[PDB]
């Protein structure tokens, strides 16, 4: 293996295949990057066991075929550390890989290419192609509601559900829920799969909001995403995801509407004097006003009052302020509509102007 | 105590004073036309003063600093904040937002400001900032020789000098001041140096500094900073500087830095060993690790002396080069087992000493 490639052309791909954390990986090879030369193409591959990213770059200069693995982070830093404009001459020499540029010489350790795991050896069953914007909309709309280190491992992921013309995402930690749907334009067979946390994070990192369409392939145990010269593949979590339609409020008698930003700032201010552990906040509902209250064990008190329009009977409801905030921060719109039934039941939250995303939050006290 | 003050006028001071129970609180005090906000810890106490253009009533109390700051920050741009003491509680009102905070009584709030100055001098913020930035990185961190964890401020005639050093390396910086003072050296602790840096906005407002036998105070505008000093015999910087360095090497700071940084990647992660071969108008930099990965850099420099190999921890050199931020560096070398001085080629005001390594 021998290639010579300009520094800024090699730097972008290396970034794209870079691991989220170089540190703390028990398996030695997982810390390495697989370099492979074929006719006119250099392929850089990074991987943990769960997922794998592959970047391809066309070689305009002399090259010779071969493959090897070298420590990814060291290799990245050496290229980054080289001056703007540099030509990087890589060459395999037995045990070592050599990197040469200007008057700088580097000798790296290797592990053999054939011990490098291949997590992209499966057959796709369903394929669709959509704009990056739409996948980004779906992931951002729900990602915050994913569980963290929950014993029901499937909750730690996000559900991608195709249903006819729509692609739907669902995330839920069991105390709250997010669901988002967007039409994708070609009718698909009904199919739902669970993508793990790190997969969702990587899938978001791909999407630059470019004009390049995103090609998505789904297998029975794996999922692959194409954007331009970059391919991302990940394993699928195996679990029985909970039905989102069961968690949505059955019959919500009362409806409350207000400005998202004003409601957010008011919740945020009250949250300062909420119990640091449980973050409970009381919501007092009146026909023309909502009163937000918070106190802590030291009996410090917060009180906000806003002008809202609300058709229903008056009531008190207890909420975790953080969950509401996560929801209001996710909406980023003009007006929010809250649907409530009673003090002991769940409450739906949504943008008043769009039905495409819904949020369900559990009550307190 | 009652005051009403515009949000953006209260926000800057609160920031300035930000930093067991009562130490978490902020002391608010009203006098004729003035609100004083004080933040403190058993080491350093710092004060902000703001003039009140609106109705007020005198009094004092303490309230949790962080909560009080967040409530003001959290209020909308342009807001009028009405504070009022009500028995056990302090009340904060703006628009239809209302907050009741816990208090602890003003008279339990510790005071670190009662002491007599012995030496007073005034200088520009730029100069103090130059002195602190030039050496701060060389301060020790959590060392058992506790005095090393600080920085030395030494007055010597017409100059103010800072020195920072761990056992391994050293930084010294000197900057002239207008009035000749008596010889005096004191050790400001880590958190003091950090706060002193925080004060300096690079404004035209002169900085007034007062030194007592066990404390130091700094005045900039309406902001006052005071800290305990560290007790200890700080080592003599003049003993560590190379005595008579025959060999002098000159290089471009940035090129030397990037080359040392690239080699450092394949240095031993624990000891950071790096070898420097110096020869006629050239340096060769070398590094290897336990896995026998190797790095090698060569640069055009200017060097006329005898040829030698010398080794140093690369972090220490990089830290120095990163601190210099200049066009060219002069390195003063004596031999392979001796320490080496580093300085900006264009200014003698800051010197850096780094020891050798037998690889």
Automatic annotation (TrEMBL), chain B:
Residues 1-113 form the DNA polymerase III beta sliding clamp N-terminal domain. InterPro entries: DNA_clamp_sf, DNA_polIII_beta, DNA_polIII_beta_C, DNA_polIII_beta_cen, DNA_polIII_beta_N. CDD domains: beta_clamp. Keywords: Cytoplasm, DNA replication, DNA-binding, DNA-directed DNA polymerase, Nucleotidyltransferase, Transferase. The keyword Nucleotidyltransferase applies. GO terms for biological process: DNA strand elongation involved in DNA replication. Residues 122-236 form the DNA polymerase III beta sliding clamp central domain. GO terms for cellular component: cytoplasm; DNA polymerase III complex. It is found in: Cytoplasm. One of its GO terms (molecular function) is DNA binding. SMART domains: POL3Bc. Residues 238-358 form the DNA polymerase III beta sliding clamp C-terminal domain. Forms a ring-shaped head-to-tail homodimer around DNA. Confers DNA tethering and processivity to DNA polymerases and other proteins. Acts as a clamp, forming a ring around DNA (a reaction catalyzed by the clamp-loading complex) which diffuses in an ATP-independent manner freely and bidirectionally along dsDNA. Initially characterized for its ability to contact the catalytic subunit of DNA polymerase III (Pol III), a complex, multichain enzyme responsible for most of the replicative synthesis in bacteria; Pol III exhibits 3'-5' exonuclease proofreading activity. This is Beta sliding clamp.
């Amino acid at each position: 293996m021998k290639f010579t490639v300009e520094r800024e052309h090699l730097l972008k791909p290396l970034q794209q295949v870079s691991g989220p954390l170089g540190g703390r990986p028990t398996l030695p090879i997982l810390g390495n990057l697989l370099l492979q030369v074929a006719d006119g193409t250099l392929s850089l591959t990074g991987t943990d066991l769960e997922m794998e990213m592959i970047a391809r770059v066309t070689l305009s200069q002399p090259h010779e075929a071969g493959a090897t693995t070298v420590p990814a982070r060291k290799f990245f830093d050496i290229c980054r550390g080289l001056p703007e404009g540099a030509e990087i001459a890589v060459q395999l020499e037995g045990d070592r890989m050599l990197v040469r540029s200007g008057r700088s010489r580097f000798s790296l350790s290797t592990l053999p290419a054939a011990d490098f795991p291949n997590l992209d050896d499966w057959q796709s069953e369903v394929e669709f192609t959509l704009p990056q914007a739409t996948m980004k909309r779906l992931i951002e709309a729900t990602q915050f509601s994913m569980a963290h280190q929950d014993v029901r491992y499937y909750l730690n992921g996000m559900l991608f559900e195709t249903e006819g013309e729509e692609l739907r995402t669902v995330a839920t930690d069991g105390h709250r829920l997010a669901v988002c749907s967007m039409p994708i334009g070609d009718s698909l067979p009904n199919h739902s799969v669970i993508v793990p946390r790190k997969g969702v994070i990587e899938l978001m990192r791909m999407l630059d909001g470019g004009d390049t369409p995103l090609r998505v392939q789904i297998g029975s145990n794996n999922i692959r995403a194409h954007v331009g010269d970059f391919v991302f593949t990940s394993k699928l979590v195996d679990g029985r995801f909970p039905d989102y339609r069961r968690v949505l409020p059955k019959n919500p008698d009362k409806t409350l509407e207000a400005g998202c930003d004003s409601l957010k700032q008011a919740f945020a201010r009250a949250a300062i004097l909420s119990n640091e552990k449980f973050r409970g906040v009381r919501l007092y509902v009146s026909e023309n006003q909502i009163k937000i209250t918070a106190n802590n064990p030291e009996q410090e008190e917060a009180e906000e009052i806003l002008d809202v329009t609300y058709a229903g009977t008056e009531m008190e409801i207890g909420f975790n302020v953080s969950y509401v905030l996560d929801v209001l921060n996710a909406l980023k719109c003009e007006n929010v509509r809250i649907l409530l039934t009673d003090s002991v039941s769940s409450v739906q939250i949504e943008d008043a102007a769009s039905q495409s995303a819904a949020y369900v939050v559990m009550p307190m006290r």
